[PDB]
């Protein structure tokens, strides 16, 4: 079976170097061009350049000429895309793809986050309720992505919305998770949000209930 497998996600600081990879199997790697594609958050596709692993013949899209280096190690069926000095603007998902002239096969993507922010775990605050009620959890001031949120250890899935995080000006993410439930349940049923931010090893369980006076 033909496949392109890209290396894992990366979280970097401005000024750091980075070399991401793309390995091909199920075919002769030296017989196909490999191209790299950039997709910035909430945006479209951009061709970055192309390489023939047989002889390392390389061509760059003009926008990327001299911004990155595309290379290949044919002895191990791998193509590479590298930066010697990263900027925050380099934050994007990066795809490799097998280019057939005579783009059928694509890698799974490598998410690259470039930020001056530093690893930090969230504080979790309640969104307290006041025959449908809403209640939830505000997962504030963390870096980097992702957080996972479940409700009652997975026993409550219905009516849960966990929102995409927003990037604050401070460089830290913030996210909300909410659920809607019967109002009559508020005094009897327990609602706990289970938050985890693995990168900072912060695990939190927050009980949410009507704020008393």
């Amino acid at each position: 079976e033909v496949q392109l497998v890209q290396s894992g996600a990366e979280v970097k600081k401005p000024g750091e170097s980075l070399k991401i990879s793309c390995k091909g199997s199920g075919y002769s790697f030296t017989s196909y061009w490999i191209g790299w594609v950039r997709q910035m958050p909430g945006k479209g596709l951009e061709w970055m350049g192309i390489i023939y692993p047989g002889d390392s013949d390389t061509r760059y899209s003009p926008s990327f000429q001299g911004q990155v280096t595309i290379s290949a190690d044919k002895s191990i069926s791998t193509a590479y895309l590298q930066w010697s000095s990263l900027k925050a603007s380099d934050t994007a998902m990066y795809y490799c793809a097998r280019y057939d002239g005579i783009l059928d096969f694509w890698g799974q993507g490598t998410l690259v986050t470039v930020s001056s922010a530093s690893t930090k775990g969230p504080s979790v605050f309640p969104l307290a309720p006041s025959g449908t009620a809403a209640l939830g959890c505000l997962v504030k001031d963390y870096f980097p992505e992702p957080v996972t949120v479940s409700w009652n250890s997975g026993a409550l899935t219905s009516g849960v919305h966990t929102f995409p995080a927003v990037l604050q000006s401070s460089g830290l993410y913030s996210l909300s998770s909410v659920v809607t439930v019967p109002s009559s349940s508020l005094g009897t049923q327990t609602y706990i949000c289970n938050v985890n931010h693995k990168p900072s090893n912060t695990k939190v369980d927050k009980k949410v209930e009507p704020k008393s006076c």
Partner: protein
């Protein structure tokens, strides 16, 4: 370089409807035009190559035509799995370039948001910042305006929002907006309000609370 312009930016159609998407090139690309499909967090997937040829595995409902500078992708009848972003790509000249995407979104009956406002927690206030949150739940279409008001003062530039992916069961959207101010600012004011404008609402809906009261 050859610039590909796609239209419309967003197609809203119901499952079963015919989808018609356009790609216009800044110069002739001959027939060297491909269409790709992309779902969130997934790699793009080739549908059409050389303008009119279906890639292997692609169902008959997908077809393309055009040559030169004008191209059309057609999905004869939309299946649930077809709602996604579609890209055109030209392979005529270097650099390889793509259109900016067309999002095919599921049209359903208009639904008004249920609106909910949340005061900041006491714990948050203890450490110097206030987050007031507003939830707009289960609405269609996507377009909605949240207007924050602090003692009737229309707030601007100090809020952020995000929107869920369209729901797989009922095709609605939910939106969360956060107003952020300093603890000191939060404590000067009485009435905190979230005004929601949406096509599903005859006139704007407002939810509010008075700081520190039940």
């Amino acid at each position: 370089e050859i610039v590909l312009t796609q239209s419309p930016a967003t197609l809203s159609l119901s499952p079963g409807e015919r989808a018609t998407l356009s790609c216009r090139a800044s110069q002739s690309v001959s027939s060297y035009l491909a269409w790709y499909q992309q779902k969130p967090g997934q790699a793009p997937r080739l549908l059409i190559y050389d303008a009119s040829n279906r890639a292997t595995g692609i169902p008959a409902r997908f077809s393309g035509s055009g040559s030169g500078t004008d191209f059309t992708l057609t999905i004869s009848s939309l299946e649930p799995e077809d709602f996604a972003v579609y890209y055109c790509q030209q392979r005529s000249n270097w650099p390889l370039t793509f259109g900016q995407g067309t999002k095919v979104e599921i049209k359903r009956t208009v639904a008004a948001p249920s609106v909910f406002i949340f005061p900041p927690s006491d714990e948050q206030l203890k450490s110097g910042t206030a987050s007031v949150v507003c939830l707009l739940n289960n609405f269609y279409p996507r377009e909605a305006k949240v207007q924050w008001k602090v003692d009737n003062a229309l707030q601007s530039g100090n809020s952020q929002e995000s929107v869920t992916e369209q729901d797989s069961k009922d095709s609605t959207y939910s939106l969360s907006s956060t107003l952020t101010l300093s603890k000191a600012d939060y404590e000067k004011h009485k009435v905190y309000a979230c005004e929601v404008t949406h096509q599903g609402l005859s006139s704007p809906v407002t939810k509010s609370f008075n700081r520190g009261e039940c």
